[PDB]
């Protein structure tokens, strides 16, 4: 229940982040997402334990296309690179 896990962060780094690294009691995460204007970005950081199951599960019904993935070992997200969910075409 104490801050023991270390993660890499990018775009979600806290202010006291040391060398693009954040500390947490929860999980590390990486997320690839497409914004309202079709741009895709990869970000990552730390996620507190409370509510991590909800966030790591995410929802298929999210309005924006995205994939978030979590892991719970030191710097496990440095090479974590999720792929976007496929776009369903049709009925055409």
């Amino acid at each position: 229940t104490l801050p023991f896990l270390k993660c890499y962060c990018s775009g979600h780094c806290p202010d006291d982040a040391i060398n693009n690294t954040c500390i947490t009691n929860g999980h590390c995460f990486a997320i690839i997402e497409e914004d309202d204007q079709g741009e895709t970005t990869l970000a990552s950081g730390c996620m507190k334990y409370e509510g991590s199951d909800f966030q790591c599960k995410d929802s298929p019904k999210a309005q924006l296309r995205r994939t978030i993935e979590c892991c719970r070992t030191n710097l496990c997200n440095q090479y974590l690179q999720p792929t976007l969910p496929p776009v369903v075409i049709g009925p055409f």
């Binding site: 202010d15 950081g45 507190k48 409370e50 509510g51 929802s59």
Partner: protein
């Protein structure tokens, strides 16, 4: 993103608001304030609750449900010296006056 939930500057000057007649010291202070979007996902430093996390997910699915709000999640105190109604001097360490951290709730 410049638009995300974070602390912003705010100096409260007692002379300007007009409280210098009853507040002796300090002349004012940095109160700051929180502002910014709380988009998915909510990082650790945003000190969110299970409820705000769930609301953030619901908003992601249904925009009719509002996003969590950026508010102070850690505040600090400052000492003030003032005059009560009886023109008597009082020293008090006012709690929750300064924003130290912002989060989504």
């Amino acid at each position: 993103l410049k638009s995300s939930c974070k602390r912003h500057p705010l100096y409260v000057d007692f002379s300007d608001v007009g409280w210098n007649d009853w507040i002796v010291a300090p002349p004012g202070y940095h109160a700051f304030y929180c502002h910014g979007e709380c988009p998915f996902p909510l990082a650790d430093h945003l000190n969110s609750t299970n409820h705000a996390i769930v609301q953030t997910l619901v908003n992601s699915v249904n925009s009719k449900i509002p996003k969590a709000c950026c508010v102070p999640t850690e505040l600090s105190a400052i000492s003030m010296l003032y005059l009560d109604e009886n023109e008597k001097v009082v020293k008090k360490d006012y709690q929750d006056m300064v924003v130290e951290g912002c989060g989504c709730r």
